Each structure stands twice: as structure tokens, then as C-alpha cells.
């Protein structure tokens, strides 16, 4: 509907319905799950935050070769005051917005679109392993 758009000059003192949403949206095993994601994707950090090099890393993997322009482009058109960088706060909140965006967006038939989180997702797993349950003990 309406919604909120200014912070109301108000800073902290509440953020607990942010967090309450991923909450929601997000169970406490894909909350483990999305932190495994945000060190990975931490890693090699220039500043420590996602970049083009970072994001620019998983598009060669994918095949693809964006110029650095489209990166940095997609960086401020997706970040939430156009700083450029997507910080933990900002990042936290964009994966959950392209959850229930993606959800919002469906309708019927749907189009080849660059490439699927769930393919994304399942491709950074990789193979399946448990063996983390079991040490002492090997089964494969
Ligand atoms: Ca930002």
C-alpha cells in the first residue's frame, strides 16, 4: 500500500521488523545457510563487501562476461541508497527482497531468465555430502 520509505530521522530503536520478516520468510536452517553464502561470498572482498570482482567471480563461472560498467550499474540500481557498496545490513535485506520478488513475480509461464536462484543454489552445494554427521564412520 503506502508503506515506509524515509528511516523517519529516527535511527535504531527498532530494525526488529526487518528481522522479524527474514524470520518469517527465512527458517532457522536456511538462516545458517545464508550466512555459509555471505562468507563465500565475503571471500576475496576488496573492501570486505560484495563487489565487481565479486560478482563479476560468479558471472565467469556462469558463462557469462559482463563489462565492469554493468556491474557497477546493477550495484547502485540494486543498492538501497546508491552508495555502490552492498553492506551486511544491505545485503541481508536484498537477498530477502529477491526471495519474495521473485515469488511476487510468477503469474504463468514463465521465461528463460539468466539462470534460477535454485540453480544457483544447488550449484554452489555441489554434491550432496552428510559426512559431516558422521566422522569416525564412512558411508558413501
Ligand atoms: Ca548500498
Redesign the pocket.
Given at each position: 500500500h503506502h508503506h515506509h520509505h524515509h528511516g523517519g530521522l529516527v535511527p535504531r530503536g527498532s530494525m526488529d521488523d526487518i528481522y522479524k520478516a527474514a524470520v518469517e520468510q527465512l527458517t532457522e536452517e536456511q538462516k545458517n545457510e545464508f550466512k555459509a553464502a555471505f562468507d563465500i561470498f565475503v571471500l576475496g572482498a576488496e573492501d570486505g563487501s560484495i563487489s565487481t570482482k565479486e560478482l563479476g567471480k560468479v558471472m565467469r563461472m556462469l558463462g557469462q562476461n559482463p563489462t565492469p560498467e554493468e556491474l557497477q550499474e546493477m550495484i547502485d540500481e540494486v543498492?538501497?541508497?546508491?552508495?555502490?557498496?552492498?553492506?551486511f545490513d544491505?545485503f541481508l535485506v536484498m537477498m530477502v527482497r529477491c526471495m519474495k520478488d521473485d515469488s511476487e513475480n510468477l503469474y504463468f509461464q514463465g521465461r528463460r531468465v539468466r539462470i534460477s536462484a535454485d540453480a544457483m543454489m544447488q550449484a554452489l552445494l555441489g554434491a550432496r555430502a552428510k559426512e559431516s554427521l558422521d566422522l569416525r564412520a564412512h558411508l558413501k
Open positions: 543498492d538501497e541508497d546508491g552508495s555502490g557498496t552492498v553492506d544491505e
